[PDB]
Design a protein around this ligand. Structure first.
Ligand SMILES: *[C@@H](C)C1=C(C)C(=O)N[C@H]1Cc1[nH]c(/C=C2\N=C(C[C@H]3NC(=O)C(CC)=C3C)C(C)=C2CCC(=O)O)c(CCC(=O)O)c1C
Ligand SMILES: *[C@H](C)[C@H]1/C(=C/C2=NC(=C\c3[nH]c(C[C@H]4NC(=O)C(C=C)=C4C)c(C)c3CCC(=O)O)/C(CCC(=O)O)=C2C)NC(=O)[C@@H]1C
Ligand SMILES: C=CC1=C(C)[C@@H](Cc2[nH]c(/C=C3N=C(/C=C4\NC(=O)[C@H](C)[C@H]4CC)C(C)=C\3CCC(=O)O)c(CCC(=O)O)c2C)NC1=O
Ligand SMILES: C=CC1=C(C)[C@@H](Cc2[nH]c(/C=C3N=C(/C=C4\NC(=O)[C@H](C)[C@H]4CC)C(C)=C\3CCC(=O)O)c(CCC(=O)O)c2C)NC1=O
Ligand SMILES: C=CC1=C(C)[C@@H](Cc2[nH]c(/C=C3N=C(/C=C4\NC(=O)[C@H](C)[C@H]4CC)C(C)=C\3CCC(=O)O)c(CCC(=O)O)c2C)NC1=O
Ligand SMILES: C=CC1=C(C)[C@@H](Cc2[nH]c(/C=C3N=C(/C=C4\NC(=O)[C@H](C)[C@H]4CC)C(C)=C\3CCC(=O)O)c(CCC(=O)O)c2C)NC1=O
Ligand SMILES: C=CC1=C(C)[C@@H](Cc2[nH]c(/C=C3N=C(/C=C4\NC(=O)[C@H](C)[C@H]4CC)C(C)=C\3CCC(=O)O)c(CCC(=O)O)c2C)NC1=O
Ligand SMILES: C=CC1=C(C)[C@@H](Cc2[nH]c(/C=C3N=C(/C=C4\NC(=O)[C@H](C)[C@H]4CC)C(C)=C\3CCC(=O)O)c(CCC(=O)O)c2C)NC1=O
Ligand SMILES: C=CC1=C(C)[C@@H](Cc2[nH]c(/C=C3N=C(/C=C4\NC(=O)[C@H](C)[C@H]4CC)C(C)=C\3CCC(=O)O)c(CCC(=O)O)c2C)NC1=O
Ligand SMILES: C=CC1=C(C)[C@@H](Cc2[nH]c(/C=C3N=C(/C=C4\NC(=O)[C@H](C)[C@H]4CC)C(C)=C\3CCC(=O)O)c(CCC(=O)O)c2C)NC1=O
Ligand SMILES: CCC1=C(C)/C(=C\C2=NC(=C\c3[nH]c(CC4NC(=O)C(C)=C4CC)c(C)c3CCC(=O)O)/C(CCC(=O)O)=C2C)NC1=O
Ligand SMILES: CCC1=C(C)/C(=C\C2=NC(=C\c3[nH]c(C[C@H]4NC(=O)C(C)=C4CC)c(C)c3CCC(=O)O)/C(CCC(=O)O)=C2C)NC1=O
Ligand SMILES: CCC1=C(C)[C@@H](CC2=N/C(=C\c3[nH]c(C[C@@H]4NC(=O)C(C)=C4CC)c(C)c3CCC(=O)O)C(CCC(=O)O)=C2C)NC1=O
Ligand SMILES: CCC1=C(C)[C@@H](CC2=N/C(=C\c3[nH]c(C[C@@H]4NC(=O)C(C)=C4CC)c(C)c3CCC(=O)O)C(CCC(=O)O)=C2C)NC1=O
Lengths: 106, 245, 164, 177, 164, 177, 177, 164
């Protein structure tokens, strides 16, 4: 959530990676107790939408130092956890860090 | 399936064609630097056109009482046509603008680094150099029957060099809406008569200068440079290919 | 928007499956329940003006203190606002009635209406007096078909139960 | 994601009025059609895997440069990514068939794929060829004129719906290029 | 288990809402498609034995090398297994057919079948020969009702399209 | 997560055979019932918020120790958590009405609730009283014998189904204790 | 544009001191080499067009998906742009040979080539294959071991220089990918 | 930078040609004149210190009014600046002498020097006194070879004829 991609390509790639993670978690159609779960009581979902967009705006306002540190960190960390001397995914992590940040998956 | 919900990034084709996109989020920075830097070049050469402070004959822009605003409408539409290009036209423009900026740089290492570094910045250098110098096609003035004739012939051969196909491309586009044509005709005639009313030494250094652009476009041909020594408006007729027209 | 086919396609998309026979039975139910609530939608687009008129008139018939000079609705323009607001509500009942589900009525009208109405000193009990007035004035056989009427009842009840 | 219904409702919301009979009449053509669209989706979603396999295998048959070394299909990795991409395309097309509007197809898959494939060096012409083969195979299944598998159906006319499906595959093939 | 009701329920549980008319509409589709599927389920419980017998007999009629002494099915106990395996499959088609959707057929038979069948040296094409044999021996009017038959078709095709 | 259908299927799977005609006959009683269950769930889900308000208000009314300081309803925060918990309970009850089986109620709500209230010191007898009041109010709505609101329904008998819903509320009230 | 001279001088300017015997010694290796580089440049610049023809022809030979319809070599216009691109690549490589430093190659050709080919959908692995074939053909001409044309030259050792030219081709092939 | 091989490669790049025999003869003349002016570069890197010292000392020996309390060279720090400036000049003569041509000496030292020197009250005649002092103290046989010396003369004269 904190990391913001710098391109149309990293938007679609990052989106796709996240989708593939959640689809790897749950194959069956029925939603699983826990998970995302925006709705507990009526009127929750809208606040969820609002808090989400606000955190997107603060994710947008960040400094140069913070952004660059977050990108190196996300590239390395997601490599150490999900890239096992595999030049394709090592390449597509170092290339686009927001996909790696989607690959953190925790 | 886009990752960012709010203000999702949409780099322009020009931004992507160039190396501006980067890890640091430079794309905001580099794109901005180019825009500001480009104006700087234009304001420098507009400072060279009017040293004394009053606007010259070149900057008149309109005789009819509302034709100035028409030029403002036309300038923005022309930039919009510049933005509607395909991929290959963009890379073709960035390479040819690059090489022409380097050939106008006259070997200054520093400048060459800053033309490769800022492709967007170079293109306005080419245009603004050729407008400030006076060695441009708009500023051609024939002075015999044979100059006028060979600007017709030379001009036609240039337009055949630009559109080999029968389809008129984006680059020509005289009008946007109805009644645009007649107004563009009016201002276009006012430009030529306006050029008639320049000062003397400006026209003399324009002639020499158009010859100097003729030598470069001509490159190594005794024939062509012989003709430019015969008639200097041909050097103005050497447009670059990064124009269509 | 929340609807039948958007719930099923959304679920299949989140799961990453093809649409199997379960979604087919869901859209079967959609295309069978359709004609009823669309009939109700036709009659709502018929006489919405008298619906809004009786709604707001009975709304101020119950709550007179609104036209007193504290409470908000104390000028002709703001009674036009109260009437105008109801018109929005009946049109969103028409929209959600056409869609099937509560999708457009929730996402246009209900979502974040708590902050707006609680901010601008707007009482919900006035709205609920209007809607329950219309729901009591409704009918079994005389204007509509009974089955479709039930659909209308549902949507209107949802509005009330999304307000307070 | 907006179906037929939500499309009519959003257009009436921009028009800022009630939906009306006209729009309701076109909606009665949709709902009154119904199980022709259902049987159609049953046909495509039945033979799904096999469509995707035949289409991409045919795509590699037209130009063997893909499976040639240096081509984008040259490895098992690349071939698998290829197959799942055709499968996802077919998936969203079927979504757009049940939906009656291409909103889901435009938002969830189409919006930003061209730039992505260009950034990864997927050849777009090859993809449009594959979309075209999936088009022909899926329209042949949807008209039950497939020469291999031909199942019993209640007879009638469903050419308009075939024109709709052809329009969604033309939307994808026009989008990838 | 993946079913129309579960999807409607799951969607409402993930959203945190009371079940509005959309799930009711989805349910209506369930109670309307129910009879066609359940009739097919009755007949599948009728003659499953002959279905499995012709399925496996035609399966080894196509692939003879399996009873050769490399490949797996080369002993009487393993032909009993092959026959037994199919019986699980037809019983799951009966289960999913009664449920509505692909729920029990997916979660009992399909999920993780790839590792097991790829591990134990088991070819899918033998299964597909069996299923397609049954699908070609099917019928329009003589045994079943046509409409319910379509449901059966769908389920069987799903098994094939989940297998290879 | 199991409805009627899935319960029949799981019972037949423990029995390890095919479903048959007997279980299908009970399922034909379910499907043949149908819109009585639909109209029932429409009735409870219509007046749902109203039911939660009345039931919790009645629960506070019988014993004012809850609103007394030291009681678990003494503050706005804890009264809010009380009201949303009554709402969520009614939500899952309505889910068990559509499902026909208490699987969703056992798995998605009941699983870990008694421990949670024990860990928070919520009085369980008070909760069973509130579930009882929601039971009475919800059966009164579901039979359309509600003293304020009496809407048109096609005539008939829905007592079986009210016994089902009474069973679910007795399951919840027995569970919270 | 910086040759070996300007590279030594820029390095000494960043070091902020005078020239010095070490950098002058490497410059004496350059100057003392001299006409080996002259004869080398004469060799590659002589057989340049033929190198471009052979290398692009071989590149089409390894994978005929280029010439297959949908491939980027399927037309005469795309093939002409292909031939002039190979020619201009070899032109800037020969510039880097006279120069002794890759500055002209980095500025005038390399700076924005990857983005260009990505924007045009040019297959990058096929370009690196073409650069590889031009590498081997150019080293074979530079050592005068070409099996078709072998011209008479004053004898000696030019392995170092071959290593330099191989470094330039590896720079281009590394850049296009 | 302006040099032999950069002029020829720049001309071939602007022309769009392969480097023909003309550029080969140009770099032939570069590699033939090279050893001389690189020897002069070696000796300049040898004794630049006493070159700058006698240059500046003779520069204030000619112009005493600079250490007068009006002009810029009236403090010890600015005489250190004057000597330092001369050190940059001799280092640029060494750089352009190594390169061949006037490239780094033009683009680093000459370009934009007019605005700085004219702005900061710096007289050029003091620099010209320094350079002409070095040119008159030069030598025919004793320190250098005569031919390379001529190269040094050229570079130094270029500086003077680029200054005033
Ligand atoms: C978790 C990752 C989820 C998966 C997996 C999934 O398929 N969808 C997620 C859970 C989910 N969410 C809803 C319902 C709503 N979610 C909302 C929040 C978003 N809406 C916004 O505008 C924004 C900010 C831009 C966000 C974050 C809202 C609002 C709703 C609708 C609320 C309502 O009143 O109905 C659902 C149910 C809908 C569906 O997908 O079927 C699910 C499963
Ligand atoms: C028949 C067309 C095959 C083949 C069948 C064999 N299957 C064997 C083992 C085995 N099969 C399954 C799948 C089955 N078990 C289930 O629980 C379900 C569904 C609920 C299915 C569809 C499993 C999980 C296993 C492993 C456990 C077991 O041994 O039962 C099998 C034994 C293989 C061996 O031990 O070598 C055979 C022979 N026989 C053939 O000739 C064709 C290919
Ligand atoms: C946009 C960019 C982008 C990527 C870079 C990938 C990255 C990626 N790979 C996988 C998933 C996977 N990736 C691999 C790959 C590997 N097999 C090995 O033997 C090697 C270690 C390695 C290749 C070098 C495997 C095997 C899986 C499946 C893992 C599993 O299910 O066990 C997943 C989870 C979803 C899935 O199963 O596909 C994701 C997000 N996906 C993307 O969307
Ligand atoms: C009315 C006057 C008049 C002229 C003076 C010419 C000038 C001229 N020459 C060319 C075009 C050309 N001119 C030359 C000539 C050259 N070949 C070389 O080796 C030398 C450097 C040079 C001869 C000395 C070449 C080769 C082209 C084609 C360039 C190309 O397509 O690459 C073009 C573009 C159109 C075309 O392709 O013909 C024009 C306008 N045309 C005119 O109408
Ligand atoms: C689009 C949907 C739609 C509806 C559902 C109706 C709802 C409706 N009914 C009435 C109006 C009315 N509705 C009724 C009906 C009733 N008579 C009784 O004995 C019963 C309580 C009840 C039938 C079950 C009556 C009697 C009136 C007239 C009331 C009066 O004038 O006193 C009005 C006011 C305008 C009018 O007089 O017609 C409206 C808006 N109109 C609409 O446009
Ligand atoms: C799409 C749906 C939709 C709605 C339902 C309305 C809801 C709504 N009403 C108001 C605003 C208002 N609404 C009312 C209405 C009231 N007057 C009273 O006496 C009664 C309590 C009540 C009618 C029953 C009034 C008076 C205002 C103006 C309040 C003020 O400015 O003081 C506003 C703020 C903007 C405005 O001033 O118009 C909004 C969003 N608007 C929408 O877009
Ligand atoms: C839940 C799953 C489910 C299905 C799969 C369908 C299956 C289905 N289709 C039809 C009905 C129909 N289905 C088709 C479709 C066809 N038109 C042709 O040209 C082709 C042969 C074929 C599409 C491939 C047609 C034309 C009808 C109407 C037949 C008629 O009235 O003559 C009917 C009868 C009711 C009706 O008229 O809609 C049913 C049950 N319905 C369902 O509820
Ligand atoms: C998706 C939304 C949806 C609805 C709103 C209902 C609405 C509805 N209910 C019935 C039908 C019915 N609805 C009920 C319900 C009951 N009658 C009573 O007297 C009890 C008080 C009450 C249960 C609490 C009954 C008993 C019938 C059948 C007989 C009748 O009309 O009353 C019918 C006719 C078809 C049938 O018989 O099932 C319809 C369309 N159905 C739906 O699918
Ligand atoms: C302007 C055009 C021009 C040329 C055509 C060359 C021609 C040329 N080459 C050499 C000289 C040389 N030329 C080479 C070149 C090589 N010898 C090999 O065995 C390799 C195959 C090949 C490099 C690919 C070598 C090694 C020498 C020095 C020794 C010799 O004569 O072979 C010489 C003598 C001077 C010297 O030593 O440099 C001359 C005039 N020089 C020029 O200025
Ligand atoms: C790369 C080459 C290079 C140079 C050649 C110098 C040239 C140079 N000198 C000065 C600046 C200066 N240069 C001198 C030198 C002079 N004192 C006098 O009495 C004499 C007239 C003269 C020595 C002969 C002085 C005094 C200043 C400071 C002037 C002042 O601040 O008033 C400055 C402005 C920046 C500064 O203050 O240092 C520059 C660019 N700098 C360079 O980067
Ligand atoms: C002759 C030099 C030259 C020019 C001027 C050129 C392009 C060009 N500039 C043009 C216009 C144009 N360019 C300028 C800029 C300008 N004029 C000057 O005298 C100076 C010193 C300028 C800035 C460098 C003006 C004032 C105009 C007139 C007002 C206007 O039309 O917007 C036109 C005419 C139509 C159009 O707008 O495109 C053209 C075709 N291409 C060239 O080679
Ligand atoms: C030590 C942990 C830590 C936390 C938790 C933190 C910030 C923080 N993230 C928070 C929230 C928060 N952060 C995440 C982060 C997250 N999402 C992911 O997919 C992954 C891998 C995440 C971990 C970085 C989620 C899911 C949430 C829940 C959604 C939500 O509540 O909006 C909160 C709570 C309040 C808020 O929403 O801002 C806080 C306070 N800063 C920290 O250093
Ligand atoms: C040698 C490399 C090669 C291939 C691989 C095929 C691939 C292929 N299948 C087609 C088209 C095609 N493919 C199928 C599906 C297929 N047929 C069936 O009857 C069954 C059961 C199928 C899956 C097993 C159908 C149904 C069609 C439509 C034509 C038809 O009626 O058969 C078409 C025509 C495309 C078009 O119309 O534009 C092609 C090119 N062709 C090749 O040249
Ligand atoms: C003084 C503190 C206090 C309360 C608050 C009430 C709350 C209350 N309502 C009940 C039950 C109840 N409540 C309603 C709903 C209600 N009636 C209507 O006709 C309309 C329109 C309603 C919403 C406005 C109905 C319909 C019933 C069922 C009994 C009946 O037929 O009225 C019951 C009986 C519970 C049971 O049967 O176990 C109680 C305790 N009682 C109290 O002692």
């Amino acid at each position: 959530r904190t990391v913001r991609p710098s391109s149309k390509a990293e938007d679609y790639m990052a989106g796709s990676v996240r989708m593939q993670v959640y689809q790897k978690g749950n194959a069956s159609g029925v939603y699983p107790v826990g998970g995302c779960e925006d709705g507990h009581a009526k009127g929750d979902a809208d606040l969820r939408r609002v808090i989400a967009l606000a955190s997107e705006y603060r994710a947008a306002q960040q400094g140069a130092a913070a952004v660059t540190g977050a990108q190196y960190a996300s590239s390395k960390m997601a490599i150490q956890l999900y890239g096992h001397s595999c030049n394709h995914e090592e390449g597509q992590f170092c290339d686009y860090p927001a996909v790696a940040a989607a690959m953190c998956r925790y | 399936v886009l990752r960012t919900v709010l203000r999702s990034p949409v780099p322009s084709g020009a931004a992507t064609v160039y190396g501006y996109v980067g890890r640091g989020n430079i794309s905001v920075i580099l794109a901005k630097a180019d825009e500001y830097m480009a104006k700087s070049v234009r304001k420098q050469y507009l400072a060279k056109s009017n040293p004394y402070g009053t606007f010259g004959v070149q900057c008149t822009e309109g005789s009819v009482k509302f034709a100035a605003d028409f030029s403002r409408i036309r300038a923005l539409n022309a930039e919009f046509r510049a933005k509607l290009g395909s991929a290959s036209k963009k890379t073709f423009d960035m390479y040819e603008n690059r090489k022409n900026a380097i050939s106008n740089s006259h070997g200054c290492h520093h400048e060459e680094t800053q033309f490769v570094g800022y492709k967007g910045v170079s293109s306005m250098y080419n245009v603004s150099k050729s407008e400030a110098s006076g060695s441009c096609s708009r500023y051609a003035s024939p002075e015999t029957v044979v100059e006028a004739a060979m600007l017709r012939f030379m001009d036609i051969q240039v337009k055949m060099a630009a559109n080999p196909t029968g389809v008129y491309n984006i680059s020509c586009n005289e009008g946007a809406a109805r009644g645009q044509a007649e107004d563009v005709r009016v201002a276009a005639l006012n430009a030529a008569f306006r050029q008639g009313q320049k000062s003397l030494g400006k026209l003399l250094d324009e002639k020499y200068q158009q010859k100097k652009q003729g030598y470069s476009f001509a490159h190594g041909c005794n024939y062509e440079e012989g003709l430019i020594n015969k008639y200097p408006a041909l050097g103005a007729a050497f447009r670059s290919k990064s124009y269509g027209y | 928007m929340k609807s039948v086919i958007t719930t099923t396609i959304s679920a299949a998309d989140a799961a990453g499956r093809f649409p199997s026979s379960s979604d087919l039975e869901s859209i079967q139910g959609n295309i069978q329940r359709a004609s009823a609530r669309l009939e109700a939608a036709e009659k709502l687009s018929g006489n919405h003006e008298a619906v809004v008129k009786e709604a707001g008139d009975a709304c101020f018939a119950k709550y007179s203190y609104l036209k007193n000079s504290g409470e908000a609705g104390d000028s002709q323009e703001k009674i036009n606002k109260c009437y105008r607001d109801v018109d929005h509500y009946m049109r969103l009942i028409n929209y959600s009635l056409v869609v099937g589900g509560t999708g457009p009525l929730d996402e246009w009208g209900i979502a974040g209406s708590r902050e707006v109405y609680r901010t601008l000193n707007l009482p919900g009990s006035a709205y609920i007096a209007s809607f329950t007035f219309t729901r009591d004035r409704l009918c079994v056989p005389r204007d509509m078909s009974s089955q479709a009427g039930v659909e209308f009842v549902a949507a209107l009840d949802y509005v009330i139960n999304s307000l307070s | 994601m907006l179906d037929a219904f939500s499309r009519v409702v959003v257009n009436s919301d921009s028009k800022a009025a009630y939906v009306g009979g006209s729009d309701l009449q076109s909606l009665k053509t949709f709902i009154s059609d119904g199980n022709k669209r259902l049987d159609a989706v049953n046909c495509i979603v039945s033979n799904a895997s096999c469509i995707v396999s035949d289409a991409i295998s045919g795509m590699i048959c037209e130009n063997p440069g893909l499976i040639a070394p240096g081509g984008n299909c040259y490895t098992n990795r690349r071939m698998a990514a290829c197959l799942r991409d055709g499968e996802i395309i077919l998936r969203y097309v079927s979504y757009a068939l049940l939906a009656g509007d291409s909103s889901v197809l435009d938002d969830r898959c189409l919006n930003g794929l061209k730039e992505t494939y260009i950034a990864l060096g997927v050849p777009t012409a090859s993809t449009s060829r594959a979309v075209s083969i999936m088009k022909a195979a899926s329209t042949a299944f949807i008209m039950n004129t497939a020469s291999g598998r031909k199942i019993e159906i209640a007879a009638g006319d469903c050419q308009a719906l075939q024109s709709e499906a052809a329009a969604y595959f033309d939307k994808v093939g026009s989008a990838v290029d």
